[PDB]
Design a binder for this molecule. Structure first.
Ligand SMILES: COC1=C2C[C@@H](C)C[C@H](OC)[C@H](O)[C@H](C)/C=C(\C)[C@@H](OC(N)=O)[C@@H](OC)/C=C\C=C(/C)C(=O)NC(=C(c3ccccc3)C1=O)C2=O
Ligand SMILES: COC1=C2C[C@@H](C)C[C@H](OC)[C@H](O)[C@H](C)/C=C(\C)[C@@H](OC(N)=O)[C@@H](OC)/C=C\C=C(/C)C(=O)NC(=C(c3ccccc3)C1=O)C2=O
Ligand code: NI
Ligand code: NI
Ligand code: NI
Ligand code: NI
Ligand code: NI
Lengths: 213, 213
């Protein structure tokens, strides 16, 4: 039960410009995804001030980062507001984003890639380190869906019958490039968070697998 | 798409006798589940000697233990052979087990609960620490299914559309009793494994969540 959608043309250009013209300061992808997780968490918390029951699907407010080294995947999960199917479709690629063209012109003129979050398109920085991404999301107002893109001209949206149930929120599942596997490392992850994601109102958890011996 | 099955009557008696008459040496449940995981791993590995492609669904052979403290759940996962739907139904409760009545008589006479694995029913030791269990399993020869029981007279078997895809093998998902939450602790888990599960041919991984600060 799987639909395909074409990306708005500037978004496709944006993604190409990120994958192919940007060389450094890649670690900023993690600040941007932590900022997005934090924005989603702010929104469910604010929503719950006048509708406490919204929190019941998942009472704990957190960000959690799960390196999956054998799969070469990094997951960034939040228990924020989540996105409905129509929200994944409208906001993750089909509709013109304010910022998209403006950001690409600032980049052309010499702007540091890190300014991407200030243009409201910092989601697409994930393509600095990942050649495939799934956004698995569960809004209180919809079923769990999977949005997926390999940075081509199109993305798919699919009713989620394959992943763990999230009570509420989003998993960013990044299929890292072979040159960017340092973001599977516990120490590298902690460093980038401590240096660049210093003021976050929510706990940030790191899931570590160790061998018992 | 969810079927209910009655437990064979001695199995129901066994489970009651475990929950209600046994007081100590509870930690043996972990040795038994590690032994079962190890038996499942031996079987896929042996199967693959003459059918290498069996391993392709999940090339890594491991046991992994994931404490889920906010859910009061402990999961024990293996990438062994897994069980088909008909295997969950036949082997986990509907058919008479050799050992069941014999074990219950040995227990009555004073046998230590730890002898349960020697009677071939050591699976049911999980009821020392858990009041609910899901066995989520994926055999190469079937779809993923969920078997579930709260130790009543019946269990359910359900096509799995809610949990993460396992490539191949089994997750024991234990809903721990409130008095047995020590088995959520990293140090307690390591101790019981080091003391009682010393000779295991497969890596045993422990998944730990820490806050980054
Ligand atoms: C306004 O809002 C925004 C946006 C638009 C939209 C998309 C939003 C959305 O809707 C549905 C929502 O609200 C959400 C909450 C989302 C978010 C942030 C997220 O996530 C999560 N984790 O959940 C995301 O990711 C997936 C999506 C998108 C993003 C983007 C595109 C960007 O980059 N930015 C932004 C953003 C940002 C910027 C900066 C920082 C952060 C974020 C924002 O805020 C926006 O857009
Ligand atoms: C013969 O075989 C057995 C049994 C019977 C059956 C059930 C088996 C089965 O079938 C399907 C299979 O083969 C598998 C491999 C399984 C197993 C072990 C497992 O797991 C896993 N992890 O996977 C289990 O759990 C879920 C199941 C069951 C168990 C039981 C009941 C017991 O206790 N024991 C045994 C057992 C044991 C004993 C001792 C130690 C370990 C195990 C065994 O071995 C048996 O039975
Ligand atoms: Ni690098
Ligand atoms: Ni830095
Ligand atoms: Ni279906
Ligand atoms: Ni105790
Ligand atoms: Ni002991």
């Amino acid at each position: 039960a799987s639909e395909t959608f074409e990306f708005q043309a500037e978004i496709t250009q944006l993604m190409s410009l990120i994958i192919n013209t940007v060389y450094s300061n890649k670690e900023i992808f993690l600040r941007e995804l932590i900022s997005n997780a934090s924005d989603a968490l702010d929104k469910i918390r604010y929503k719950s001030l006048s509708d406490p029951k919204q929190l019941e699907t998942e009472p704990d407010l957190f960000i959690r980062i799960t390196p999956k080294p054998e799969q070469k995947v990094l997951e960034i999960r939040d228990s924020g507001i989540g996105m409905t199917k129509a929200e994944l479709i409208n906001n993750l690629g089909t509709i013109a984003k304010s910022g998209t063209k403006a950001f690409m012109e600032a980049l052309s003129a010499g702007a540091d890639v890190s300014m991407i979050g200030q243009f409201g398109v910092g989601f697409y920085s994930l393509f600095l380190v990942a050649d495939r991404v799934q956004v698995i999301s569960k809004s209180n107002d919809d079923e769990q869906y999977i949005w997926e893109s390999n940075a081509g001209g199109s993305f798919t949206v699919t009713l989620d019958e394959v992943n763990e149930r999230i009570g509420r929120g989003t998993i960013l599942r990044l299929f890292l490039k072979d040159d960017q596997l340092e973001y599977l490392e516990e120490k590298r992850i902690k460093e980038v968070i401590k240096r660049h994601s210093e003021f976050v109102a929510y706990p940030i958890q790191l899931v570590v697998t160790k061998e018992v011996e």
